[PDB]
Amino acid sequence: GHMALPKDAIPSLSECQCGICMEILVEPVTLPCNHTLCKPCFQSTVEKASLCCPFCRRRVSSWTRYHTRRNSLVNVELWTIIQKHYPRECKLRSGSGSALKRINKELSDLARDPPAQCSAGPVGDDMFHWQATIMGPNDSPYQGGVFFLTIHFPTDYPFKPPKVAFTTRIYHPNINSNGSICLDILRSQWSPALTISKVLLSICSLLCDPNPDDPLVPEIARIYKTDRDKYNRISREWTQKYAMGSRKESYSIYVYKVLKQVHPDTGISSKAMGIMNSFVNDIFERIAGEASRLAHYNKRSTITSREIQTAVRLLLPGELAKHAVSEGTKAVTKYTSSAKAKTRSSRAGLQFPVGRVHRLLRKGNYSERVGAGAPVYLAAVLEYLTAEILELAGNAARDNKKTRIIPRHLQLAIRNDEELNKLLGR
Ligand SMILES: [Cl-]
Ligand SMILES: [Cl-]
Ligand SMILES: [Cl-]
Ligand SMILES: [Cl-]
Ligand SMILES: [Cl-]
Ligand SMILES: [Cl-]
Ligand SMILES: [Cl-]
Ligand code: NA
Ligand code: NA
Ligand code: NA
Ligand SMILES: [Zn+2]
Ligand SMILES: [Zn+2]
After folding, report:
1. Where does the record place the catalytic residues?
2. Cα–Cα dist 404/393, whole Å
């Protein structure tokens, strides 16, 4: 064999991607500065144009001349490693380097491996104009909020940075009232190899740990430095007011994702979202409480998916119970028959958070132990009920010639549906 690496040091697939086109490196060309790009990108952006490294701008015209003559451009050692360990991706692989193709590849990459607690895509058939959704991290006063952002890609992307700004009002020392963001990755530390995913992850990290010494809003930075408790309080209050936060547990991001499944071209107002959140918290409390009592009455230390199933039948009207039971069972069987995945929800095929529901079931002191199937089942039931409610309310907004769901549409859809009225009458 030409060579081999220690198992520890075999590069991942993502570490084998071309920093310019975001496709797997094929015939990787490593420049004398030790920056690498795939040969098609080398041809389109170096050999045919500037004769400079796209990453560090070092001139490589002499190097190119020498190695083009000898057909020694390719880093054969790297090339062998990549072919041996990712042969299928190599085989599937001035066209390269084009901005439109790079943005499309990043979009696909988001579909296959979406970033933790984020999401982004084109707003309306213009690939250079995206909307992004971030959820407030749990280690931050923004927990439970849904922050929307805009992303404008420049025509020379990825060589110039994307333009990213919050559309959702937020109380942050590095984010101003227009939504502009002071973050190194967007300007001083931008690199063609960086992606929208890494930017969204860098923003989430900024929400967790602001930088008060380089602020866009000096008053907020001063408060963060002097009265951190006041900063956290105002941050939380703004999250509730503008980012669909909640005094209780928040499900807003998951409600929104479900809404985009059943009615993609339909929105929801913060007040209607607050109602959805009350529903989910009520269904959770009722099911979890009944499941607590079922385990206790039957001298069982553990709440499993069986107590959740029985609680569902006791609490929901007939047709809703049967469908909820079917969805909860489908999720548990899919989960147990699937490999461990990035999120437990993804393993279960759900939008609602299985890991969070499990934590809540144990934090609520409902029982000594909580089996792994219970949160899968419960989360699927909350998702099913959310999906049925939103489908009706969306249908009602369409009949009222409205593009956004409001509390009136929610109240209409629940009063007109007999079983939902019984369940959520209050
Ligand atoms: Cl190897
Ligand atoms: Cl040379
Ligand atoms: Cl492969
Ligand atoms: Cl293969
Ligand atoms: Cl998880
Ligand atoms: Cl999966
Ligand atoms: Cl279980
Ligand atoms: Na801006
Ligand atoms: Na029932
Ligand atoms: Na598990
Ligand atoms: Zn490339
Ligand atoms: Zn370089």
Report:
1. 182 (glycyl thioester intermediate)
2. 10
Q: Which of 193, 398, 386 is nearest to 284 (CA)?
A: 386
This structure's resolution (Å) is: 2.3
Method used to solve the structure: X-ray
DSSP 127-162: TTEEEEEEE--SSSTTTT-EEEEEEE--TTTTTS--
Q: Is the alpha carbon torsion for 387, 393, 398, 401 positive or negative?
A: negative
User: 7-42 burial, b for 16+ CB within 10 Å, e for fewer?
Assistant: eeeeeeeeebbbbbbbbbbbbbbbbeeebbbbbbbb
Tell me the residue type at 111: A
CATH architecture of 252-423: Orthogonal Bundle (1.10)
Judge residue 74's burial from the number of C-beta atoms within 10 Å of its C-beta, 0-12 exposed, 13-18 middle, 19 or more buried.
middle
Q: Nearest-CA neighbor of 30 among 94, 73, 80, 85?
A: 73
Ligand with an atom nearest the CA of residue 348: 6
The ligand whose atoms approach the alpha carbon of 354 most closely is 5
Q: For the domain made up of 102-242, give the CATH fold.
A: Ubiquitin Conjugating Enzyme (3.10.110)
Catalytic center residues: 182
Instruction: Provide the 3-class DSSP secondary structure of residue 269.
Output: coil
